[PDB]
Amino acid sequence: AQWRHRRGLLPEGDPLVAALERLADRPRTHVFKAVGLIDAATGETAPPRDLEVADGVVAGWSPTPPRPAPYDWYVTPGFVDAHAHVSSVSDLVGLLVHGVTAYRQLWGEPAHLLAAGVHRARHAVLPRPWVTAGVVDGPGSHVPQAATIVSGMRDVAKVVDDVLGFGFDGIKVYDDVERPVFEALVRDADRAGIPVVGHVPQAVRLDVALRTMRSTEHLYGFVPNVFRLPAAERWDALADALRHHLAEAAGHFVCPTLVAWRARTGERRFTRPSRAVLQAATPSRRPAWQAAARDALRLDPAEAERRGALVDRLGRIARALAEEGARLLVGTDCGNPFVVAGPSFHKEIAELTRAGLGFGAVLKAATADAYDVMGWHDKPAAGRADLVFYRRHPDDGPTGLARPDGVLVDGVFLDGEDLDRLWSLRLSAAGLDPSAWARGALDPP
Ligand SMILES: [Cl-]
Ligand SMILES: [Zn+2]
Ligand SMILES: [Zn+2]
């Protein structure tokens, strides 16, 4: 049914789709005066230059004439959510409003390729996807319904056929892929130029996974995927793993999704489960989110504190990996309970900076290194005009990067009132009064 429903992210008659279609009729040619381009690696700002955008491509920079000219704008490359589960147009709007102009879809379907076609066609304003061919897992998978079960070379070949035939961007592996099958998959994907991402399989050595996979997610491998265990043992098992706990990761892309770990604990300090966030969830997600809310309500505060401390340690592991030369990415697992597409991206920046990552490092993870892991080798602020605009430097002020004053998406400029209106519509469509969740707040106050 994946072909019949391939337009499922952009359903006819939907008000959010209609808004994104109207926005795609906007001009894609601009001049922005006195722009300070923030260097995606260092966080320093180039001198003020006038930015020329032509048909959605960065055409050039003209020095702003002096009296040294002040900055009218500070600009970053567009952000990349390196681990998103986009299932509805609500998610697409949430990402755009928060400056996320591209995402890795780590459970890809034909519907995401369709969305990529809409992006190429300029028929709606939306973030650009990087799409896996579903997810590959072994027999004994914990997700056998949703996973493509691979147990030999012919099964591996069929996945490579789908990737190369339909233009998927990579292959995602799950925990129960058998070791001989993994070895054949990474050998054959490598020969075909296909990146392999996902979970370090239980049957695979960490060092082998680090040198063969384009990226590894959730810190699995460094720590166990305790969510494969019964609920009552999970956090004890994580505590034990950390009790017994990097330079092998130098140069490798690591997407820790700390915001998702935090939300799975049932803690409330940073995840802030609430009736308002449940109202904002899409109808298909509300049952699972409500069940998670019940778990959070029932959790003894002392245990919540214990689990939060374990996720803090995961963040320090992510920092230590970066200090050894690993290449961190900012991904959210948005769609998981109380991980909201858009704000969760900035929650993950907050997790990484709480762990000690500086502004420049987290900006590089949000942008330049994500374009590299996706194989998009235009310079981060060149080629397609995907950029985020701020009237004040985003390393100052209360919202950081989370409240752009503009987002340029393939040349369409969404100004602050456009961003307010899109966010308000995203909330109203889900049944939440927009005044309950001002743009720039990461949770409804
Ligand atoms: Cl409840
Ligand atoms: Zn995962
Ligand atoms: Zn995921």
Coordinates of C-alpha atoms and ligand atoms in Angstrom, one line a residue:
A1 CA 0.0 0.0 0.0
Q2 CA 3.1 2.2 0.1
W3 CA 2.6 3.3 -3.5
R4 CA -1.1 4.0 -3.4
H5 CA -0.5 6.2 -0.3
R6 CA 2.8 7.8 -1.6
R7 CA 1.3 11.3 -1.3
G8 CA 0.4 10.7 2.4
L9 CA 2.6 13.4 3.7
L10 CA 0.8 16.0 1.6
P11 CA -2.8 15.1 1.6
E12 CA -5.3 16.9 -0.6
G13 CA -7.5 19.5 1.2
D14 CA -5.3 19.8 4.2
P15 CA -4.9 23.4 5.5
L16 CA -1.2 23.0 6.3
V17 CA -0.5 21.6 2.8
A18 CA -2.4 24.4 1.3
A19 CA -0.3 26.9 3.3
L20 CA 3.0 25.3 2.1
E21 CA 1.7 25.2 -1.5
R22 CA 0.9 29.0 -1.4
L23 CA 4.3 29.8 0.0
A24 CA 6.0 27.9 -2.9
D25 CA 4.6 30.6 -5.2
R26 CA 6.8 33.2 -3.5
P27 CA 9.9 34.9 -5.1
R28 CA 13.1 32.9 -4.9
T29 CA 15.3 35.8 -5.8
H30 CA 16.5 38.3 -3.1
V31 CA 19.1 40.7 -1.9
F32 CA 19.6 40.7 1.8
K33 CA 21.8 43.7 2.9
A34 CA 24.5 43.7 5.5
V35 CA 24.5 40.0 6.4
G36 CA 26.9 38.5 8.8
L37 CA 27.5 34.9 7.7
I38 CA 28.3 32.8 10.8
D39 CA 31.0 30.2 10.0
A40 CA 29.4 26.8 10.5
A41 CA 32.6 25.5 12.1
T42 CA 33.9 28.3 14.3
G43 CA 30.8 30.4 15.1
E44 CA 32.6 33.6 14.1
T45 CA 31.0 36.1 11.8
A46 CA 32.3 37.3 8.5
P47 CA 32.2 41.0 7.8
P48 CA 28.9 42.4 6.6
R49 CA 28.1 41.6 3.1
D50 CA 25.1 41.9 0.8
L51 CA 23.7 38.4 0.0
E52 CA 22.4 37.8 -3.5
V53 CA 20.0 34.9 -4.0
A54 CA 19.0 34.0 -7.6
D55 CA 16.3 31.4 -8.2
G56 CA 16.9 29.8 -4.9
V57 CA 20.7 29.5 -5.2
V58 CA 23.3 31.6 -3.3
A59 CA 24.7 33.8 -6.1
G60 CA 27.2 35.8 -4.3
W61 CA 28.3 38.2 -1.5
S62 CA 29.0 41.9 -2.0
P63 CA 30.9 43.8 0.7
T64 CA 28.6 46.2 2.4
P65 CA 29.8 49.8 1.9
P66 CA 30.9 51.6 5.1
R67 CA 31.9 54.0 9.1
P68 CA 32.0 50.2 9.4
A69 CA 28.6 49.0 8.3
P70 CA 26.5 47.4 11.1
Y71 CA 24.9 43.9 10.6
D72 CA 21.3 43.9 9.7
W73 CA 21.2 40.1 9.9
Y74 CA 23.2 37.2 11.2
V75 CA 22.8 34.1 9.1
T76 CA 23.6 30.4 9.5
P77 CA 23.2 27.5 7.1
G78 CA 19.9 25.8 7.5
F79 CA 19.7 23.1 10.2
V80 CA 19.5 19.4 9.7
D81 CA 17.6 17.1 12.0
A82 CA 19.9 14.1 11.7
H83 CA 17.3 11.6 13.0
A84 CA 13.7 12.5 12.3
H85 CA 10.6 10.3 11.8
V86 CA 8.4 12.6 9.7
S87 CA 4.9 11.0 9.4
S88 CA 2.8 14.1 8.7
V89 CA 2.8 17.6 7.3
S90 CA 2.6 18.8 10.9
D91 CA 6.1 17.5 11.4
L92 CA 7.3 19.3 8.2
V93 CA 5.9 22.6 9.4
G94 CA 7.4 22.2 12.9
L95 CA 10.9 21.6 11.4
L96 CA 10.7 24.6 9.1
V97 CA 9.5 27.0 11.8
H98 CA 12.5 26.0 13.8
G99 CA 15.0 26.6 11.0
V100 CA 15.3 22.9 10.0
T101 CA 15.5 22.8 6.3
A102 CA 16.6 19.2 5.8
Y103 CA 16.3 16.0 7.8
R104 CA 17.4 12.3 7.7
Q105 CA 14.4 10.1 7.6
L106 CA 15.7 7.0 9.3
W107 CA 12.7 4.9 8.5
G108 CA 12.1 5.9 4.9
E109 CA 9.2 5.1 2.7
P110 CA 8.1 5.9 -0.9
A111 CA 6.1 8.8 0.7
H112 CA 9.3 10.5 1.6
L113 CA 10.7 10.1 -1.9
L114 CA 7.5 11.7 -3.1
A115 CA 8.1 14.6 -0.7
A116 CA 11.6 14.9 -2.2
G117 CA 9.9 15.2 -5.6
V118 CA 7.6 18.0 -4.4
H119 CA 10.8 19.7 -3.1
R120 CA 12.5 19.4 -6.4
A121 CA 9.4 20.5 -8.3
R122 CA 9.0 23.5 -5.9
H123 CA 5.3 22.7 -5.5
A124 CA 5.3 23.2 -1.7
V125 CA 7.8 24.7 0.8
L126 CA 9.2 21.9 2.8
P127 CA 12.5 20.6 4.2
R128 CA 14.6 18.4 2.0
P129 CA 14.7 14.7 3.0
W130 CA 17.5 12.2 3.0
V131 CA 15.6 8.9 2.9
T132 CA 16.6 5.3 3.9
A133 CA 15.1 2.3 2.2
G134 CA 13.1 1.3 5.2
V135 CA 15.1 -0.5 7.9
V136 CA 16.9 -3.8 7.6
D137 CA 16.9 -6.2 10.5
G138 CA 17.7 -9.9 11.1
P139 CA 15.4 -12.8 12.1
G140 CA 14.5 -12.4 15.7
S141 CA 13.9 -8.7 15.0
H142 CA 11.9 -6.9 17.7
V143 CA 10.1 -5.0 14.8
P144 CA 9.4 -7.7 12.3
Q145 CA 6.3 -6.1 11.0
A146 CA 8.0 -2.8 10.0
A147 CA 11.5 -4.1 9.2
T148 CA 12.8 -5.7 6.0
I149 CA 14.1 -9.1 7.3
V150 CA 17.4 -10.0 5.7
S151 CA 19.0 -13.3 6.4
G152 CA 21.3 -13.9 3.4
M153 CA 22.9 -12.4 0.3
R154 CA 19.8 -12.5 -1.9
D155 CA 17.8 -10.5 0.7
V156 CA 20.7 -8.0 0.9
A157 CA 20.8 -7.7 -2.9
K158 CA 17.0 -6.9 -3.0
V159 CA 17.6 -3.9 -0.7
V160 CA 20.4 -2.6 -2.8
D161 CA 18.1 -2.9 -5.9
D162 CA 15.5 -0.8 -4.2
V163 CA 18.0 1.8 -3.2
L164 CA 19.6 2.2 -6.6
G165 CA 16.2 1.8 -8.5
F166 CA 14.2 4.4 -6.7
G167 CA 16.9 6.7 -5.5
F168 CA 16.9 6.1 -1.7
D169 CA 19.9 7.7 -0.1
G170 CA 21.0 4.9 2.3
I171 CA 20.4 1.7 4.2
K172 CA 19.5 1.6 7.9
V173 CA 20.4 -1.4 10.0
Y174 CA 18.8 -2.5 13.2
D175 CA 20.0 -4.5 16.2
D176 CA 19.4 -8.1 15.2
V177 CA 21.2 -8.1 11.8
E178 CA 23.4 -11.2 11.9
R179 CA 27.2 -10.7 11.7
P180 CA 27.8 -12.5 8.3
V181 CA 24.8 -10.6 6.8
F182 CA 26.1 -7.3 8.1
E183 CA 29.5 -7.9 6.6
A184 CA 28.1 -8.8 3.3
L185 CA 25.7 -5.7 3.4
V186 CA 28.5 -3.2 4.2
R187 CA 30.8 -4.8 1.6
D188 CA 28.1 -4.6 -1.1
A189 CA 26.7 -1.2 -0.1
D190 CA 30.3 0.1 -0.2
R191 CA 30.8 -1.3 -3.7
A192 CA 27.6 0.4 -4.8
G193 CA 28.3 3.7 -3.1
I194 CA 25.5 3.4 -0.6
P195 CA 25.9 4.5 3.0
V196 CA 24.9 2.3 5.9
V197 CA 23.6 4.0 9.0
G198 CA 21.6 3.0 12.1
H199 CA 22.1 0.8 15.2
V200 CA 25.3 -1.0 15.8
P201 CA 24.1 -4.6 15.6
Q202 CA 24.4 -6.7 18.7
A203 CA 26.3 -9.3 16.8
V204 CA 28.9 -6.8 15.4
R205 CA 32.0 -5.5 17.1
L206 CA 31.9 -1.8 17.8
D207 CA 35.2 -1.2 16.1
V208 CA 34.0 -3.0 12.9
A209 CA 30.7 -0.9 13.0
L210 CA 32.6 2.4 13.4
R211 CA 34.8 1.8 10.4
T212 CA 32.1 0.5 8.1
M213 CA 29.0 2.6 8.9
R214 CA 28.5 6.1 7.7
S215 CA 26.9 7.0 11.0
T216 CA 25.8 5.2 14.2
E217 CA 22.8 6.3 16.2
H218 CA 21.8 6.7 19.9
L219 CA 25.3 5.8 21.2
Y220 CA 24.3 2.2 20.8
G221 CA 27.5 0.1 20.8
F222 CA 29.1 2.4 23.3
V223 CA 26.1 1.5 25.5
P224 CA 23.6 -1.2 25.0
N225 CA 20.1 -0.7 23.5
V226 CA 18.5 -1.3 26.8
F227 CA 15.0 -0.7 25.3
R228 CA 15.3 -4.3 24.0
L229 CA 15.1 -5.4 27.7
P230 CA 12.1 -5.6 30.0
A231 CA 11.2 -2.2 31.4
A232 CA 12.1 -3.1 35.0
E233 CA 15.7 -3.9 34.1
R234 CA 16.5 -1.2 31.5
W235 CA 18.0 1.5 33.6
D236 CA 19.8 -0.9 35.9
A237 CA 21.4 -2.3 32.7
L238 CA 22.3 1.1 31.5
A239 CA 23.8 2.0 35.0
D240 CA 25.8 -1.3 34.8
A241 CA 27.1 -0.4 31.3
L242 CA 28.2 3.0 32.4
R243 CA 29.7 1.6 35.6
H244 CA 32.0 -0.4 33.2
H245 CA 32.8 2.5 30.9
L246 CA 36.5 6.3 22.3
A247 CA 39.5 7.2 20.1
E248 CA 38.2 4.4 17.7
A249 CA 35.4 7.0 16.9
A250 CA 37.7 9.7 15.5
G251 CA 36.4 10.9 12.2
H252 CA 33.1 9.0 12.5
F253 CA 29.7 10.5 12.6
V254 CA 27.8 9.9 15.9
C255 CA 24.1 11.0 16.3
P256 CA 23.4 10.5 20.1
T257 CA 19.7 11.7 20.1
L258 CA 20.0 12.7 23.8
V259 CA 16.6 14.4 23.7
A260 CA 15.0 11.0 22.9
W261 CA 17.0 9.2 25.7
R262 CA 15.7 12.0 28.0
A263 CA 12.1 11.6 27.0
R264 CA 12.3 7.7 27.4
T265 CA 13.3 8.1 31.1
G266 CA 9.9 9.5 32.1
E267 CA 11.6 12.5 33.7
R268 CA 9.8 15.8 33.6
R269 CA 12.5 18.5 34.0
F270 CA 13.5 18.7 30.4
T271 CA 10.9 16.7 28.5
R272 CA 7.9 18.4 30.3
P273 CA 5.1 16.1 29.3
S274 CA 1.8 17.9 29.6
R275 CA -1.8 18.0 28.5
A276 CA -0.8 20.8 26.1
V277 CA 1.9 18.8 24.3
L278 CA -0.4 15.8 24.1
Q279 CA -3.0 18.1 22.5
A280 CA -0.4 19.1 20.0
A281 CA 0.4 15.5 19.0
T282 CA -1.0 14.2 15.8
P283 CA -4.1 11.9 16.2
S284 CA -2.1 8.8 15.3
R285 CA 0.5 9.5 17.9
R286 CA -1.8 10.5 20.8
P287 CA -2.4 6.9 22.2
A288 CA 1.3 6.1 22.5
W289 CA 2.1 9.5 23.9
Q290 CA -0.7 9.3 26.4
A291 CA 0.6 5.9 27.6
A292 CA 4.0 7.4 28.0
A293 CA 2.5 10.3 30.0
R294 CA 1.0 7.7 32.4
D295 CA 4.4 6.2 32.9
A296 CA 5.8 9.6 33.7
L297 CA 2.9 10.3 36.1
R298 CA 3.6 7.0 37.9
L299 CA 7.4 7.3 38.1
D300 CA 8.8 7.9 41.6
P301 CA 10.6 11.3 41.5
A302 CA 13.8 9.7 43.0
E303 CA 13.9 7.2 40.1
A304 CA 13.3 10.0 37.6
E305 CA 16.3 11.8 39.1
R306 CA 18.4 8.6 38.9
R307 CA 17.5 8.1 35.2
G308 CA 18.1 11.8 34.4
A309 CA 21.7 11.5 35.8
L310 CA 22.3 8.5 33.5
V311 CA 21.3 10.6 30.5
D312 CA 23.5 13.4 31.7
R313 CA 26.4 10.8 31.6
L314 CA 25.4 9.9 28.0
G315 CA 25.8 13.6 27.2
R316 CA 29.3 13.6 28.7
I317 CA 30.1 10.5 26.6
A318 CA 29.0 12.5 23.5
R319 CA 31.3 15.4 24.5
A320 CA 34.2 13.1 25.2
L321 CA 33.7 11.5 21.7
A322 CA 33.8 14.9 20.1
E323 CA 37.0 15.7 22.0
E324 CA 38.5 12.5 20.5
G325 CA 37.5 13.7 17.0
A326 CA 34.1 12.1 16.5
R327 CA 31.7 14.1 14.4
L328 CA 28.6 14.8 16.3
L329 CA 25.1 15.3 14.7
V330 CA 22.0 16.8 16.1
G331 CA 19.1 14.3 15.8
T332 CA 15.9 13.9 17.8
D333 CA 13.9 10.8 17.1
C334 CA 11.0 13.2 16.8
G335 CA 7.7 11.4 16.8
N336 CA 8.7 9.4 19.9
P337 CA 6.5 10.4 22.9
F338 CA 7.0 14.1 23.8
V339 CA 9.7 14.6 21.2
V340 CA 8.0 17.2 19.0
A341 CA 9.4 17.9 15.5
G342 CA 10.9 21.3 15.5
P343 CA 11.3 22.3 19.2
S344 CA 13.0 18.9 19.9
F345 CA 15.9 19.9 17.6
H346 CA 16.7 22.9 19.9
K347 CA 16.2 20.6 22.9
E348 CA 19.0 18.4 21.5
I349 CA 21.2 21.5 21.0
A350 CA 20.4 22.2 24.7
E351 CA 21.4 18.6 25.7
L352 CA 24.7 18.9 23.9
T353 CA 25.6 22.3 25.2
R354 CA 24.6 21.3 28.8
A355 CA 27.2 18.5 28.4
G356 CA 29.8 21.1 27.6
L357 CA 29.8 21.5 23.8
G358 CA 30.4 25.1 22.7
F359 CA 28.4 27.2 20.3
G360 CA 30.7 26.6 17.3
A361 CA 30.8 22.8 17.8
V362 CA 27.0 22.5 18.1
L363 CA 26.4 24.7 15.1
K364 CA 28.8 22.5 13.1
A365 CA 26.9 19.4 14.2
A366 CA 23.6 21.1 13.3
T367 CA 24.8 22.1 9.8
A368 CA 28.1 21.4 8.0
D369 CA 28.8 18.0 9.5
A370 CA 25.2 16.9 8.7
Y371 CA 25.5 17.9 5.1
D372 CA 28.7 15.9 5.0
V373 CA 27.1 12.8 6.5
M374 CA 24.3 13.0 3.9
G375 CA 26.8 13.2 1.1
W376 CA 25.6 16.7 0.1
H377 CA 28.9 18.3 -0.9
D378 CA 27.9 21.8 -1.7
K379 CA 29.4 24.2 0.9
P380 CA 27.0 24.7 3.8
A381 CA 26.1 28.3 2.9
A382 CA 26.4 27.9 -0.9
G383 CA 24.4 26.1 -3.5
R384 CA 20.8 25.9 -2.4
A385 CA 19.7 28.9 -0.5
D386 CA 18.8 27.2 2.7
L387 CA 19.7 29.7 5.5
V388 CA 18.5 30.9 8.9
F389 CA 18.3 34.6 9.7
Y390 CA 18.5 36.4 13.1
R391 CA 18.3 40.1 13.9
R392 CA 20.6 39.5 16.9
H393 CA 23.5 37.1 17.1
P394 CA 22.0 33.7 18.1
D395 CA 24.7 33.0 20.7
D396 CA 23.0 35.8 22.7
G397 CA 19.5 36.2 24.1
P398 CA 17.0 33.8 25.6
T399 CA 16.0 31.6 22.7
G400 CA 19.4 30.9 21.1
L401 CA 18.9 29.4 17.6
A402 CA 15.3 28.4 18.3
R403 CA 13.4 31.6 17.2
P404 CA 14.6 32.7 13.8
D405 CA 13.5 36.0 12.5
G406 CA 13.5 34.4 9.1
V407 CA 14.1 31.1 7.4
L408 CA 15.1 30.9 3.7
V409 CA 14.1 27.5 2.2
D410 CA 15.2 26.8 -1.4
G411 CA 15.0 30.6 -1.9
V412 CA 11.6 31.3 -0.3
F413 CA 12.0 33.7 2.5
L414 CA 9.7 33.0 5.5
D415 CA 9.8 36.1 7.7
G416 CA 9.0 36.2 11.4
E417 CA 5.3 36.8 10.8
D418 CA 5.2 33.9 8.3
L419 CA 6.9 31.7 11.0
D420 CA 4.5 32.8 13.7
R421 CA 1.5 32.0 11.4
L422 CA 2.8 28.6 10.3
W423 CA 3.4 27.6 13.9
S424 CA 0.0 28.9 15.0
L425 CA -1.6 26.9 12.2
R426 CA 0.3 23.8 13.1
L427 CA -1.0 24.1 16.7
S428 CA -4.6 25.0 15.8
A429 CA -4.9 22.1 13.4
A430 CA -4.0 19.7 16.2
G431 CA -6.5 21.4 18.5
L432 CA -4.3 23.5 20.7
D433 CA -4.9 27.2 21.2
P434 CA -1.8 28.9 19.6
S435 CA -1.6 31.3 22.5
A436 CA -0.6 28.3 24.7
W437 CA 2.7 27.8 22.8
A438 CA 4.5 30.9 21.6
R439 CA 7.1 30.4 18.9
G440 CA 10.6 30.1 20.4
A441 CA 9.4 28.3 23.6
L442 CA 10.5 24.7 23.5
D443 CA 7.5 23.6 25.6
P444 CA 4.1 25.2 26.2
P445 CA 4.4 27.3 29.4
Ligands
CL1 CL -2.2 10.0 31.9
ZN2 ZN 16.7 3.9 16.6
ZN3 ZN 14.6 6.4 15.1

